């Protein structure tokens, strides 16, 4: 059981996440983009309610 | 001696039979949740030349 | 999920159709095999969950608890094999049946896609424990202890059923997945305050909270060794699992609501750790140590931060294993001495060296020595509390110190010094007891190699 | 250990409940078996219901 | 046996509600709770105000 | 080494000085490292070559999994559960990716601090500013969500922040 | 390839082999203490090589070899720091331990459990090596607690003696009082700096606030037996003379001073904590010397001398001279 | 939902004719298996009460118990499914015939809804 | 093997029950002194002097030499606080107040 638990496949996707981050940073540095954006979602597709106060 | 140790050791077979029956029941219950098979937006895939279902 | 449930159900006919002198052998072997089967659930995803069907799902919060629940049964059988020797075959079979039913109820409780099913099984676990406590108990106060254990639980949990049916009437579903995706804020209202209280107090009573912890010393002292093991290892964690599951609906009301509980637990850990210093009983001391640890777990759950949840999960697993080991050691002493008081039998290291080594390891792991998972949960909860408020550390500091004290106190009173001259019936420790301690302790030191396996879904 | 855990925490929830339930049970169950008193109470509750619920 | 029984099981049946018992119990069971509640509430109110005005300098604080 | 990309984890050229023996005394370091080489490095190297030719005799490959882009929580109806499920899974994957990004930047910072040694305060300002920027970004997205975090809570936080920013900009323009 | 790392890890690794063989047959013979002594001597003569490499070049290295659990942004790994302090302290500690075991083969000649005594000594040495070579705060805490537990076990070597058990519990109590500040420091560093790693902490703390340094000072006072928490060091003389000579005199009790040395970049940027450290060291050395000049037990006198020397070490730390305090150690 | 007064209801009809348009429960239905298990438990308790070998006293009696339990369970499950089908049919018909009471909610995306955010601190 | 009458009871009020309780705990009537009759549940347990176990005679042949107790003798209510591993009340050459003031 300990051997089985030790060699469990990466269903948590840790190496997948590492490779994704590696490729993403490789691309962003080249483009000159400022790494990770402050906004998690693009503001153009968010419709705020106008205050008019 | 066969037909004699069975009458005393027959009980051992029950736990493994329950395990295989539970595996079969799990697959059978799985068979009833196929409404979205090969329909998820993340995994829309075109079937292989000799493939009928993506997963069983 | 039925690949685990069906063998557990088949454990009953196998036990009842077993030869009169082969019940223990058959039960232990098949329980260990079922535990091995349970190990498959540990391979969780970073995604939602392991949704097997509409009725049962798995989670990396549920999987360690399920594995521990399955692993506990062979240990309970081995511990109970000793004092049930002069007992008829029918009553031993009934005892094994009760243990199997308890495991089945716990297994169905921990998966439980729906909250009403969770409540039904959560309260179904109550009957086998009550019968085990009140039937195969030695003292005359087992009846009062059973009454306390039953009525504290039911007084806590009866409002929970009303709250759950009301929540389903309003929202429309009690399913965990639907509830998580459709969660909406609770307005700060008196009705919402009472709904929060009804949702929380049922799980608070079983931790138990410092105010409501009285039933636990009675139940632990008066129950047999298997009862004490199952109470300290698994039954206390049901409240923590329920809180972690039900807290999602509660926000944003939890912040204001949490203060009475946070203060009660932060002061009650100190109170119970200090109570441990002046105790004349091993079982009561272990029970109060359990109360302190579960008060810390309550604090972690109430803070409700990712590090809090990981620390709470790790601490629950570690405390379950450690407290089961401690109760087993105390029972090994009691079966020789028949007194169950620390100050009577002394200097046992001279007579039983390997058992003294087991005592030392158990006291060290109760003391939260690094890099054990006990201290992993300890430190995660402490860091989360410090981020919550920089003053909490002071209380935490006291707790740690006091904990160490009584732990070594329990190590020094019974193992060190001079052996009592009069006691002469201290026979060499059996292979069964040493195997029990080894099987208790090895999983902890194996898990400290892979902490993420017990850190919960927020890892 | 003694003041809070053994005495006051015990006094508040379990002991108070036991005392109250004992007193209520003693009061309710202590009927001498005289149908005179039973039917006088029946008359009282009948008239109270006629005066209260309409 | 007498020592253990008197220490554990003979306490409550010999309890009598007394001004000394009442005041000591109320103090030792309520005062610390309210003291710590006041302390933590004041600390958290100060922290919440500081984060509302934003003069807290929470740079590099990513784990909670 | 080709096992990892040099651009993702940059390193200086690592200029090293030359040995300049000012005395005729044979130093012990050179003889010690030569005997170490002879007694340790060669057997390890030959064992590695044997293992490498054993590996080449059997060869297989594994492929990194690729994921499509799914509409996020902002393109989901208020009660339509399927799209909310897909968006939540996508958001969790993106959260994991951002965590790994912060990990990479922290690794860069630690490597710089160790490598430049005594002048780490000056020669690691680039990595410090890089980490400050990425930490600022990461904190804004997920700092107060807490346990039971979700895409909806993150979207609500972003909306609150962006209304605050819009009000501040309007007030500054109309000041 | 650059034998510095291989040698500096090989010393610590070969320091563990007798613990592995403690279950073998050699543990049941009378050759076990000589086995442990030879292992320690070989470890010392093998660790002399990285010291020579440092003296020649000034070569420094970090070895983060095994990746432990990673929580969110934070990463925890088995990381060893082989700085000047580590590569300088390891040979001295190994030489002292070699001499101590050679002395103990004769001093414990009539002790029935001499193999267990040697095993206890080797475990303490391994844990102190872990403490000295730690690169992150969690590994340093692991060594911090391990040395304390081994000291508790060795002080109460004669468990039939009440006073030995009392002294061991005293040492545990005072070490937990210091542990409070240690845990406070760990919590503050993780929350504010986002890491337990030494490199990250130095980088993100240009002007260290009061609280983490006060926690570190409390831990150092607890483990170095300063005036506030001094009596456990004199009370620790209940153990066997080799235990007092190895742990409570020259290797274990410098743990707090060594910890304050480890964080000297943050110590120099704060002026109040330096003053507190200086005053604590001065009062500790005065009080301990004053107690020493009038004792009758030789072990008590020499232990008070050790405590006064620790006070002098923290005096050196408080005036912003950490390397000179290391030389004093 | 009091369906006693439903129009066109035969008073003492256990299963109406229109129930025959619904799929019958399968013979391997889990609820039928549970009813058979209940019958088997009844047989075991019957053997135990009369002081007979619990597992192997009367095979015919246990078989009769199981068979009767399965029979009654099958008919009860049929009636259950029919009654639930009636409830759903009535609810759908009432929703269809009263459009003004069940308006079609305007589909709104989360990107244009403002939900208050409560930080966890 | 202990009977019901051998367990501690309520506070003694009359001389006869005081003597009976003194007999129960195996001491003299003149040496017997219960705790003051307040709310705390001391009941009918003797109030032995608050002297520690360390200052007990170390040369007497106790049945428990480490704890310095005899078999049948009554046990102090706070025994576990005075076990020679904890606080002791042995007199010192210097008076308590002088040490406090001098130390302070
Ligand atoms: C240190 C490196 C070791 C490498 C070699 C591998 C060693 C594996 C040991 C596994 C543990 C033993 C099994 C547990 C119960 C004991 C088994 C038993 O029956 O023994 C009988 C056997 C024969 O007994 P006997 O002579 O017949 O009986 C005599 C009497 O009973 C009288 O008995 P006694 O008085 O001789 O008692 C036995 C002895 C030892 O027995 C024990 O107490 C066992 C339990 C000790 C730990 C207690 C829990 C604390 C939490 C630690 C968690 C570590 C988990 C790591 C992964 C573990 C995986 C299993 O007592 C002690 O030495 C106390 C040690 C206290 C250690 C304090 C410091 C702990 C932290 C150290 C750092 C660990 C990680 C380092 C990471 C960074 C660097 C790599 O004695 C032994 O086998 C002793 C074993 C040697 C001591 C090991 C102590 C350290 C172990 C730490 C865990 C493994 C770390 C691996 C990485 C190391 C790098
Ligand atoms: C969650 C769902 C899943 C599990 C379902 C749970 C329930 C299932 C069973 C329900 C009831 C049916 C059976 C009960 C009848 C009672 C008969 C009895 O006592 O047993 C004696 C009998 C052996 O004794 P005997 O030689 O015949 O003669 C001795 C006298 O009978 C009697 O000797 P005695 O009178 O001298 O001994 C005196 C003793 C005897 O008194 C008793 O034992 C009374 C029996 C228990 C009461 C039953 C109440 C009704 C059922 C309620 C179940 C509650 C579940 C809910 C959770 C709450 C837990 C309380 O009484 C006492 O000692 C007094 C104090 C007892 C302690 C406190 C009482 C607590 C009892 C609660 C038990 C609850 C679980 C029962 C499980 C089955 C137990 C047999 O046991 C058996 O052999 C029958 C056991 C089952 C047969 C298994 C055969 C199947 C294997 C082949 C087919 C393979 C299956 C898979 C197919 C595919 C594979 C290839
Ligand atoms: C007696 C004296 C000593 C004699 C023996 C001397 C030898 C000592 C060696 C023993 C320990 C020393 C440390 C050496 C560690 C090397 C092994 C380690 O690296 O493996 C670990 C593996 O261990 C497992 O991860 C942890 C064990 C699993 C624990 C499950 C418990 C077993 C089930 C039993 C029931 C459960 C009860 C409790 C319920 C929760 C960590 O693996 P990991 O770094 O990750 O990655 C492995 C490689 N990958 C990437 C290909 C996957
Ligand atoms: C015994 C062992 C422990 C058991 C468990 C104890 C934990 C449960 C205790 C419950 C915690 C507090 C309950 C209600 C808290 C509400 C907040 C209140 O305290 O603050 C003020 C409330 O003022 C006063 O507290 C009003 C209530 C006073 C009456 C309550 C009784 C006080 C003591 C009773 C304690 C007994 C508890 C156990 C009963 C068996 C705020 O003023 P206001 O803005 O207006 O109200 C805000 C709430 N709104 C928005 C819904 C309106
Ligand atoms: C406690 C467990 C339940 C067991 C109950 C006893 C089982 C043995 C009964 C044997 C068969 C009885 C069926 C009777 C034959 C024909 C019945 C038919 O003519 O009557 C119809 C009605 O059928 C019966 O009512 C159905 C009875 C079935 C009871 C089963 C439900 C049990 C509750 C769930 C627990 C699960 C028990 C499973 C194990 C048996 C028409 O009723 P109607 O004239 O229009 O209106 C009167 C009733 N109203 C007023 C309420 C509307
Ligand atoms: C010790 C536990 C903490 C106890 C704290 C308070 C104790 C004193 C209360 C004694 C019992 C009081 C009974 C009556 C309470 C009434 C509350 C109530 O009705 O709110 C129901 C509320 C809104 O009512 P509606 O009319 O439907 O809303 C429409 C208009 N908004 O709906 C709900 O949330 C239902 C949930 C049930 C409420 C729970 C009632 C019991 C008290 C809560 C549990 C706390 C006690 C737990 C006991 C602890 C023992 C271990
Ligand atoms: C509205 C009414 C609510 C009623 C709630 C009832 C709670 C359940 C407890 C019922 C106990 C009442 C009966 C009782 O205690 O009798 C005294 C009885 C005497 O023992 P007997 O065996 O009956 O005979 C003695 C003489 N030979 O005393 C006892 O033994 C009590 C021992 C167990 C105590 C159980 C404590 C249960 C209460 C815990 C707190 C929760 C209570 C429920 C409401 C809580 C409020 C949120
Ligand atoms: C021994 C007999 C065999 C000898 C010949 C083989 C020699 C080694 C060759 C093996 C190849 C290298 C190898 O083991 O692979 C890496 C593998 C780990 O896999 P990773 O992917 O790098 O990280 C885990 C996540 N994947 O390395 C190992 O685990 C083996 C050695 C690791 C260090 C040894 C363990 C020492 C510490 C024990 C745990 C102590 C508590 C935890 C530390 C606390 C730190 C905060
Ligand atoms: C705040 C900490 C509060 C202290 C906790 C007290 C815990 C009480 C229970 C402990 C159990 C009893 C016990 O251990 O016995 C006392 C035992 C035996 O006495 P001996 O001197 O060894 O006599 C032997 C010869 N016959 O000795 C002890 O260990 C007692 C230790 C108590 C210390 C408490 C005082 C600590 C005060 C420290 C304040 C200074 C802090 C330092 C500031 C540093 C800032 C940079």
H121 touches chain E (CB under 8 A): yes
Q: How many CB pairs under 8 A join D and E?
A: 24
- Map chain F to HEC letters: CCCCCCCCCCCCCCCCCCCCCCCCCCCHHHHHHHHHHHHHHHHHHHHHHHHHHHHHCCCCCCCCCCCCCCCCHHHCECCCHHHHHHHHHHHHHHHHHHHHHHHHHHHHHHHHHHHCHHHHHHHCHHHHHHHHHHHHHHHHHHCCCCCCCCHHHHHHHHHHHHHHHHHHHHHHHCC
Interface test with E, best of G69, G76, G191, G211 (most E CBs within 10 A): G191
By what technique were these coordinates determined?
cryo-EM
> Tokens 């009554």 — which residue?
I74
How many other C-beta atoms can be found within 10 angstroms of the C-beta atom of residue H59?
Answer: 10
Buried b (16+ CB within 10 A) or exposed e, G56-72: eeeebbbbbeeebbbbb
Smallest CA-to-CA distance from A42 within H107, F89, F159 is with: F159
Q: How many CB pairs under 8 A join C and G?
A: 83
The Cα I42–Cα H86 span in angstroms is: 71
Please provide the distance, in angstroms rounded to a whole number, between the alpha carbons at the two ends of chain H.
Answer: 47
> Tokens 């069906």 — which residue?
C6
> In I, which residues are within 8 Å of E20 by CB distance?
38-39
**Phi, psi torsion values for A34, nearest 5 degrees:** -85, 65
Separation of C193 CA from ligand 6 center, angstroms?
Answer: 8
How many other C-beta atoms can be found within 10 angstroms of the C-beta atom of residue A9?
Answer: 6
Task: Name which of F74, F144, F152 is nearest H121 (Cβ-Cβ).
Answer: F144
Chains contacting F with at least 3 CB pairs below 8 Å? A, B, C, E, G, H
Q: Where are the alpha helices (DSSP H) in I1-104?
A: 15-24, 96-103
DSSP string, C82-112: HHTTTS-HHHHHHHHHHHHHHHHHHHHHHH-
D3 touches chain C (CB under 8 A): no
Tally of domains in chain B: 1
Ligand nearest to the Cα of C43, by number: 3
Separation of H37 CA from ligand 5 center, angstroms?
Answer: 20
DSSP string, G220-235: HHHHHT-GGG-THHHH
In angstroms, what separates the C-alpha of H108 from chain C's closest C-alpha? 15
* Pocket residue to mutate for ligand 1, from C357, C358, C361, C436, most atoms within 8 A of Cβ: C357
The Cα C354–Cα C337 span in angstroms is: 18
Q: Where are the alpha helices (DSSP H) in chain H?
A: 30-49, 59-97
In angstroms, what separates the C-alpha of F8 from chain C's closest C-alpha? 25
Q: Is G63 helix (H, G, I), strand (E, B) or coil?
A: strand
The Cα C387–Cα E63 span in angstroms is: 9
How many other C-beta atoms can be found within 10 angstroms of the C-beta atom of residue C124?
Answer: 16
Name the burial class of residue F162, with classes exposed (0-12), middle (13-18) and buried (19+) by CB atoms within 10 angstroms of its CB: middle
The Cα B11–Cα C19 span in angstroms is: 9
In angstroms, what separates the C-alpha of F122 from chain A's closest C-alpha? 22
Q: Is the CB of C64 under 6 A from ligand 6?
A: no
Please name the residues in contact with C129: beta carbons below 8 A apart, sequence gap of 6 or more. Answer: C102, C149, C223, C227, C230, C231, C235
* Pocket residue to mutate for ligand 5, from H30, H76, H87, most atoms within 8 A of Cβ: H76
Q: What is the distance, to the nearest Å, from the Cα of residue I42 to the centroid of all Cα atoms in its chain?
A: 13
- Report yes or no on chains E and D touching (3+ CB pairs under 8 A): yes
- Report yes or no on chains H and F touching (3+ CB pairs under 8 A): yes
Cβ atoms of C210 and C265 closer than 8 Å: yes
Phi-psi region of A46 (alpha: psi -120 to 50; beta: other; left: phi over 0): beta
C379 touches chain G (CB under 8 A): yes
> In D, which residues are within 8 Å of C150 by CB distance?
none
Q: Is the CB of G149 under 6 A from ligand 1?
A: yes
Q: List the residue whose alpha carbon is closest to atom 31 of ligand 9.
A: G170
Please provide the distance, in angstroms rounded to a whole number, between the alpha carbons at the two ends of chain A.
Answer: 65
- Please indicate whether, in this complex, the C-beta atoms of F7 and A26 are within 8 angstroms of each other: yes
Packing angle of the helix pair G255-262, G84-107 (nearest 10 deg): 170
In angstroms, what separates the C-alpha of E64 from chain F's closest C-alpha? 8
- Please indicate whether, in this complex, the C-beta atoms of B15 and C52 are within 8 angstroms of each other: no
Strands C50-51 and C57-58, bridge-based pairing: antiparallel
Please name the residues in contact with F89: beta carbons below 8 A apart, sequence gap of 6 or more. Answer: B42, C47, C48, F70
Interface test with C, best of A5, A10, A18 (most C CBs within 10 A): A5
Separation of C253 CA from ligand 4 center, angstroms?
Answer: 13
Q: Is the CB of C166 under 6 A from ligand 2?
A: no
Ligand nearest to the Cα of H12, by number: 5
Ligand nearest to the Cα of C202, by number: 6
The answer for F 27-86 residues in CB contact with G (under 8 A) is 27-29, 32-33, 36, 40-41
Ligand nearest to the Cα of C233, by number: 3
Smallest CA-to-CA distance from I80 within G213, C412, F25 is with: C412
Cβ atoms of C392 and C316 closer than 8 Å: no
The conformation of residue I34, written as its DSSP 8-state character, comes to: B
Q: Is H74 helix (H, G, I), strand (E, B) or coil?
A: helix
The Cα G136–Cα G81 span in angstroms is: 9
The Cα C430–Cα C440 span in angstroms is: 16
Task: Name which of F7, F64, F140 is nearest A38 (Cβ-Cβ).
Answer: F140
Please name the residues in contact with C318: beta carbons below 8 A apart, sequence gap of 6 or more. Answer: C365, C372, C373, C374, C376, C377, C444
How many other C-beta atoms can be found within 10 angstroms of the C-beta atom of residue E27?
Answer: 11
- Please indicate whether, in this complex, the C-beta atoms of I7 and E2 are within 8 angstroms of each other: yes
| Cα separations in angstroms, C174 against C182, C381, F150 | 11, 30, 19
Helix then strand then coil, in percent of chain D rounded to 5, is: 85, 0, 15
* Pocket residue to mutate for ligand 9, from G163, G171, G173, G235, most atoms within 8 A of Cβ: G173
Q: Is the CB of C71 under 6 A from ligand 3?
A: yes
Phi-psi region of E9 (alpha: psi -120 to 50; beta: other; left: phi over 0): alpha
Question: For residue C371, which atom of ligand 1 is closest to its CA?
Answer: 53
- Please indicate whether, in this complex, the C-beta atoms of E59 and F143 are within 8 angstroms of each other: no
- Please tell me which residue of chain G has the smallest CA distance to I86: G166
H101 touches chain C (CB under 8 A): no
In angstroms, what separates the C-alpha of C104 from chain B's closest C-alpha? 14
Separation of G65 CA from ligand 8 center, angstroms?
Answer: 8
> In C, which residues are within 8 Å of A12 by CB distance?
44-46, 452, 459
> In I, which residues are within 8 Å of D3 by CB distance?
40
Ligand nearest to the Cα of C441, by number: 1
Domain containing B3: what range? 1-56
Separation of I84 CA from ligand 9 center, angstroms?
Answer: 15
Interface test with E, best of F135, F141, F161, F164 (most E CBs within 10 A): F135
- Please indicate whether, in this complex, the C-beta atoms of C43 and A11 are within 8 angstroms of each other: yes
Please name the residues in contact with G237: beta carbons below 8 A apart, sequence gap of 6 or more. Answer: G167, G244, G248, G297, G299, G300, G303
């Amino acid at each position: 059981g300990s051997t089985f638990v030790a060699y469990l496949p990466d269903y948590r996707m840790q190496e997948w996440a590492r490779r994704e981050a590696e490729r993403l940073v490789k691309y962003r540095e080249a483009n000159g983009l400022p790494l990770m954006e402050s906004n998690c979602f693009d503001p153009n597709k968010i419709q705020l309610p106008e205050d008019e106060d | 001696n066969v037909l004699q140790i069975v009458r005393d050791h027959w009980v051992h077979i029950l736990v493994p039979v329950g395990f295989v029956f539970g595996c079969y029941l799990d697959r059978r219950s799985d068979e009833k949740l196929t409404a979205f098979r090969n329909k998820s937006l993340l995994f829309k895939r075109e079937l292989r030349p000799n493939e009928e279902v993506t997963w069983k | 999920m039925l690949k685990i449930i069906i063998p557990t159900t088949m454990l009953l006919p196998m036990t009842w159709m077993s030869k009169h002198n082969m019940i223990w052998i058959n039960a232990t072997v098949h329980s260990l095999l079922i535990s091995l089967i349970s190990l498959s659930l540990l391979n969780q995803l970073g995604e939602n969950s392991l949704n097997f069907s509409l009725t049962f799902f798995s989670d990396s919060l549920s999987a360690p608890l399920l594995v521990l629940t399955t692993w506990l049964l062979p240990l309970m059988l081995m511990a109970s094999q000793s004092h049930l020797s002069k007992e008829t075959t029918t009553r031993k079979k009934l005892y094994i049946t009760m243990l199997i039913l308890l495991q089945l109820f716990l297994i169905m409780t921990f998966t439980a896609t729906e909250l009403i099913l969770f409540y039904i099984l959560f309260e179904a676990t109550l009957v086998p424990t009550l019968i085990i406590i009140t039937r195969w108990g030695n003292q005359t106060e087992r009846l009062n202890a059973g009454l306390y254990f039953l009525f504290y639980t039911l007084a806590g949990s009866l409002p929970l059923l009303v709250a759950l049916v009301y929540i389903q009437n309003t929202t429309g579903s009690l399913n965990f997945l639907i509830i998580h995706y459709w969660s909406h804020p609770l307005s700060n209202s008196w009705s919402n305050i009472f709904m929060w209280l009804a949702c929380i107090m049922a799980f608070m009573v079983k931790m138990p909270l410092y105010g409501l912890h009285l039933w636990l010393p009675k139940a632990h002292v008066e129950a047999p060794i298997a009862g004490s093991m199952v109470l300290a290892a698994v039954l206390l964690k049901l409240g923590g699992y329920g809180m972690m599951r039900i807290t999602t609906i509660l926000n944003p009301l939890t912040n204001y609501m949490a203060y009475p509980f946070l203060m009660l637990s932060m002061w009650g850990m100190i109170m119970t750790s200090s109570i441990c210093l002046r105790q004349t009983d091993l079982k009561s001391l272990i029970a109060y140590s359990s109360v302190s640890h579960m008060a810390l777990v309550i604090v972690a759950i109430m803070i409700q931060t990712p590090w809090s949840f990981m620390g709470a999960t790790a601490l629950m697993i570690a405390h379950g294993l450690t407290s089961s080991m401690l109760f087993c050691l105390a029972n090994t002493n009691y079966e020789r001495v028949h007194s169950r008081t620390m100050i009577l039998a002394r200097g046992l290291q001279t007579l039983l060296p390997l058992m003294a080594t087991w005592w030392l390891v158990a006291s060290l792991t109760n003391l939260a020595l690094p890099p054990s998972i006990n201290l992993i949960g300890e430190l995660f909860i402490i860091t989360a509390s410090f981020s919550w408020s920089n003053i909490t550390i002071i209380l935490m500091g006291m707790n740690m110190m006091i904990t160490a004290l009584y732990s070594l106190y329990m190590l020094i009173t019974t193992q060190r010094g001079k052996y009592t001259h009069h006691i002469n019936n201290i026979k060499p420790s059996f292979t069964r007891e040493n195997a029990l301690m080894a099987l208790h302790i090895l999983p902890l030191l194996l898990l400290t190699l892979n902490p993420k396996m017990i850190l919960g879904p927020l890892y | 250990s003694s003041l809070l855990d053994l005495i006051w925490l015990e006094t508040i929830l379990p002991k108070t409940t036991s005392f109250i339930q004992m007193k209520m049970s003693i009061m309710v169950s202590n009927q001498k078996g005289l149908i005179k008193l039973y039917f006088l109470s029946f008359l009282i509750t009948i008239m109270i219901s006629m005066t209260l619920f309409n | 046996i007498r020592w253990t029984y008197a220490r554990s099981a003979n306490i409550y049946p010999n309890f009598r509600p007394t001004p000394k018992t009442s005041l000591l119990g109320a103090l030792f069971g309520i005062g610390p709770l309210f003291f710590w509640y006041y302390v933590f509430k004041t600390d958290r109110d100060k922290k919440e105000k500081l984060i509302q005005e934003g003069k807290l300098d929470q740079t590099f604080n990513i784990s909670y | 080494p080709d096992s990892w990309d040099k651009d993702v984890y940059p390193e200086p050229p690592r200029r090293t000085p030359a040995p300049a023996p000012q005395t005729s005394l044979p130093n012990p370091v050179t003889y010690l490292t030569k005997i170490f080489d002879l007694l340790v490095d060669r057997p390890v190297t030959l064992a590695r070559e044997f293992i490498e030719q054993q590996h080449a005799k059997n060869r297989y490959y594994y492929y990194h999994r690729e994921f499509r882009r799914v509409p996020d929580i902002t393109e989901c109806e208020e009660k339509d559960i399927l799209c909310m499920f897909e968006a939540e899974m996508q958001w969790r994957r993106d959260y994991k990716v951002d965590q790994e990004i912060v990990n990479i930047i922290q690794e860069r910072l630690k490597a710089c601090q160790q490598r430049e040694g005594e002048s780490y305060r000056q020669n690691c300002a680039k990595e410090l500013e890089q980490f400050t920027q990425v930490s600022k970004a990461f904190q804004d997205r997920y700092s107060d969500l807490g346990a039971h975090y979700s895409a909806r809570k993150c979207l609500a936080k972003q909306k609150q922040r962006m209304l605050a920013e819009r009000k501040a900009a309007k007030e500054a323009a109309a000041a | 390839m650059n034998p510095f790392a291989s040698l500096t890890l090989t010393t610590l690794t070969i320091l563990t082999i007798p613990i592995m063989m403690s279950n073998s047959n050699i543990y049941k013979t009378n050759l076990y203490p000589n086995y442990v002594k030879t292992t320690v001597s070989y470890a010392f003569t093998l660790s002399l090589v990285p010291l020579l490499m440092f003296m020649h070049t000034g070569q420094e290295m970090i070895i983060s070899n095994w990746h432990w659990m990673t929580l969110q942004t934070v990463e925890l790994s088995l990381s060893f720091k082989m700085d000047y302090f580590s590569v300088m302290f390891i040979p001295v500690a190994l030489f002292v331990t070699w001499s101590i075991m050679e002395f103990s083969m004769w001093y414990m000649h009539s002790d029935p459990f001499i193999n267990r005594f040697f095993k206890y000594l080797l475990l303490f040495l391994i844990t102190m090596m872990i403490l000295v070579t730690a690169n992150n705060l969690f590994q340093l805490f692991i060594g911090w607690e391990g040395v304390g537990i081994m000291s508790f076990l060795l002080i109460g070597w004669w468990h039939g003696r009440t006073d030995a058990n009392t002294a061991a519990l005293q040492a545990i109590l005072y070490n937990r009082i210091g542990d409070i500040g240690f845990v406070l420091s760990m919590a503050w560093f993780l929350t504010h700096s986002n890491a337990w790693d030494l490199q990250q902490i130095f980088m993100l703390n240009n002007e260290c606030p009061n609280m983490p340094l006060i926690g570190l000072l409390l831990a150092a006072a607890g483990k170095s037996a300063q005036f506030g928490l001094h009596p456990w060091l004199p009370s620790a003389m209940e153990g066997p003379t080799p235990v007092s000579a190895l742990l409570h005199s020259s290797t274990m009790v410098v743990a707090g001073v060594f910890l304050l040395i480890r964080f000297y970049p943050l110590m120099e940027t704060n002026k109040l904590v330096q003053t507190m450290t200086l005053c604590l060291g001065a009062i500790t050395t005065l009080f301990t010397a004053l107690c020493a000049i009038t004792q009758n037990d030789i072990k008590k006198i020499v232990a008070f001398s050790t405590s006064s020397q620790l006070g002098l070490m923290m005096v050196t730390i408080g005036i912003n001279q950490p390397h000179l305090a290391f030389l004093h150690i | 939902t009091m369906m006693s007064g439903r129009p066109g209801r035969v008073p003492l009809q256990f299963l109406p004719n229109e129930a025959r348009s619904l799929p019958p429960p399968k013979l391997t239905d889990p609820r039928l298996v549970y009813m058979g298990f209940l019958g088997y438990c009844s047989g075991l308790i019957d053997n135990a009460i009369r002081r007979r070998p619990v597992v192997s006293a009367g095979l015919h009696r246990q078989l009769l118990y199981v068979t009767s339990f399965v029979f009654f369970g099958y008919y009860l499950l049929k009636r259950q499914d029919y009654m639930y089908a009636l409830r759903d049919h009535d609810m759908f018909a009432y929703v269809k015939s009263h459009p003004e009471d069940f308006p079609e909610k305007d589909k709104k995306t989360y990107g244009e809804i403002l939900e208050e955010f409560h930080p966890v601190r | 093997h202990v009977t019901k009458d051998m367990f501690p009871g309520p506070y003694p009020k009359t001389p006869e029950e005081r003597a009976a309780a003194a007999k129960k705990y195996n001491m003299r009537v003149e040496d017997y002194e219960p705790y003051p009759d307040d709310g705390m549940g001391y009941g009918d347990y003797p109030k032995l002097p608050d002297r520690s176990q360390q200052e007990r005679d170390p040369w007497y042949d106790w049945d428990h030499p480490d704890l310095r107790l005899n078999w049948g003798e009554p046990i102090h209510w706070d025994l576990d606080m005075y076990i020679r591993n904890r606080v002791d009340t042995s007199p010192t050459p210097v008076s308590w107040n002088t040490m406090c003031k001098h130390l302070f």
